[PDB]
Every structure is written in C-alpha cells, then in structure tokens.
Amino acid sequence: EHVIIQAEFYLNPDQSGEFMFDFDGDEIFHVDMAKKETVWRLEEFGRFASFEAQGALANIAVDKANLEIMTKRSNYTPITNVPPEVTVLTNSPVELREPNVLICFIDKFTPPVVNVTWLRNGKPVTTGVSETVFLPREDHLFRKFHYLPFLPSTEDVYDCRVEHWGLDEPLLKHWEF
C-alpha cells in the first residue's frame, strides 16, 4: 500500500499558490511559482525524473479562478484560523561537538501562512537554515518543517518562534543540551 498525492492551493487575498507531490507523507517535489522551476525535495530525484513546471502555473490559475467562484458562492464566508502545535527536536542524539540539526515541526494549522524565526541565546539566526513548503494533512490542515544546523555546546540555548493568525501570542518552543 502506497499513496501519491498531488496537492495544490490558492489563498486570498494573499494571492499565494503552491503545487507539490507527496509520497507516503514525504514531499517528492514542489514548483517554485516565481522561478517557474521544479524543486526536488532530495536533489538526487532530479537525476531520475522530471516535471514540466509551467503546467503547475496553469493549474494554479484555474484554482484561483475557482477560489473566487466559491468565495462568492459561500457569500464571503472566511476560513477559521486553526493555530499550530509546534515541536522542536534534534535529527540525532546529541553528542558534544558532533554537528546536528534542530528540527522545528509545525503541525495541524490553517490557513497556510506562518512566520518562523530561529533564536539562539535570544538572537535570530539564519546561517544554514532551510524550510519546506506547506505539506498536506488528511484533515486538510497543514504541516511544515524548518531546520537549523548547529554545533552542540553546553552554553547555547535555542528557540523556534512561530507566529500565526490563530495564536494570541507568538509561540516559542525551547531546546537546550
């Protein structure tokens, strides 16, 4: 048993679209809407497979048109914000001076708009961070991962700070060695 999902959305009034494939919960690729480019989740995938990025843009255009029809058909009933639960964990057991990766897992939320900051000793860090696009859930909420590579030390602390319209305050998940 396996499942492949082609998941798309359009969001108003942000005018944001996304287009991705999921295999058993993992992203295969997504399309960069700006660059009109196929972005394989693992680089090695692009060595075996290809995808015509331009087609996603045409799909998104149809989705946009349809969203506008349904918005008027619902007589402008808006989405209800569902705030995320957030978990911070490491990629591996933490050994001193063996490099590792902080994972910030953001789960069960909608609409698909968040602002995520990595904090180190209270300060924003951007060096080496990366993130995924918005990943689908059966209940039609979203998931998302952000990553922060780091060298373990007994004197650093970390925070993943997440903002979403359904939270009253920015959510802050702490981690330390």
């Binding site: 492949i4 108003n12 497979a49 619902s74 989405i79």
Partner: protein
C-alpha cells in the same frame, strides 16, 4: 521520466493585517494496492477546511460532499468526455507516475543507525535514527526475554526529509549478569540489528 500532472476542472461561470482569508485546496490522491494491481483515484476539492465535492474512481463520477459542492458535481458530471478522462486517469496518471518514481520511492531503503545509552534505577534509551521506510519494529530484551512492561516510545517520527526516527526507552533495575538488548527489525536489513548494554 516525466511525471504527469492532473488538471482541475473549471467551475461554471456566472504593522498588521486583519483581512479575512479564503482558501481553496485541490488534491489528487493515487492509492496503490499491491503495486499497481489495484488503483483508486480520489480527487478532493476543499473550500476553507471543508471538502465540498469529490471524484472517486470507484464511484465513476463526481459526488457533492456538502451542498456547496452540489453545482460543481452536477456541472462536471454533465461533461461526459471529462468524466471518462478522469476514469482513465487511474492508468494515464496514477499507474504512470507510480512507474516513473518507483525506483526511488517504493524501492527506497535507508538503514537505521541504532544506539543505546542511559538517560528502580536505570532508564535506557534505544535511539533509532535516519531510516526509510517508516515500517519498523523496535524490541527490548532482558537477557533472552522480550520485555514490554516499563517501556515508553515516541512512536514513528517523520523528519520531513525522507528519513524517520524513533526513541524507545526501558526502565531497568539492573542486576548482575543482565544483558539488555535493543533489537531493530527493518526492511533495509535481512538480519535484525541488535545493540547490547550492560
């Protein structure tokens, strides 16, 4: 090989940010049983958080999920060429894409890295990291006997990067001569992986 995409049908034509939002989601789900032996296509159309209309390859046509989805179900079902298009999609789309990606998805295998370390007296951690796929079994043994009591597990954690991990811990009152073993069973290896602690 080139992955194929399915195309949503068009509906019928007639400091701060406190604006309301409107969300439209589209999902084409290809469900595979025993490779491509049995295949079901599920097209889900979702306004805000509510699925409103769907195509189910086992039904053969659109069905409204909510009253909101009703005119779409009827408009699209009135287009016979479109329906047989979607009906044939189980082959031209699902089976095709399964074939294109099979080698690096279905056949993907990464071996777990397994370690044991301390955290009544002693709590032991069996860390099992960076494996694929998710299907796995982690078992604790005290000497020769499997131990299921005093065990706490995180369960399967998906890392978001085509790897998984899991942590399984065992409460021990260690005694003389006791060997504790964490055993891992995973499709990547033919024999079990075992790690001993004393």
């Amino acid at each position: 090989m080139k992955m194929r995409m399915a195309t949503p049908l068009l509906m019928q034509a007639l400091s701060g940010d406190t604006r309301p939002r409107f969300l439209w989601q589209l999902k084409f789900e290809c469900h595979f049983f025993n490779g491509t032996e049995r295949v079901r296509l599920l097209e889900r159309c979702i306004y805000n958080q509510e699925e409103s209309v769907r195509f189910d390859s086992d039904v053969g046509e659109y069905r409204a999920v909510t009253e909101l989805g009703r005119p779409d179900a009827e408009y699209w079902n009135s287009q016979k060429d479109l329906l047989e298009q979607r009906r044939a999609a189980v082959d031209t789309y699902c089976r095709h894409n399964y074939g294109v990606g099979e080698s690096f998805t279905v056949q993907r295998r990464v071996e777990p890295k397994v370690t044991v370390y301390p955290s009544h007296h002693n709590l032991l951690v069996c860390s099992v990291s960076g494996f694929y796929p998710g299907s796995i079994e982690v078992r604790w043994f005290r000497n020769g006997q499997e131990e299921k009591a005093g065990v706490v597990s995180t369960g399967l954690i998906q890392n978001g990067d085509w790897t998984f991990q899991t942590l399984v811990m065992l409460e021990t009152v260690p005694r003389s001569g006791e060997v504790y073993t964490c055993q891992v069973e995973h499709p990547s290896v033919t024999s079990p992986l075992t790690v001993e602690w004393r």
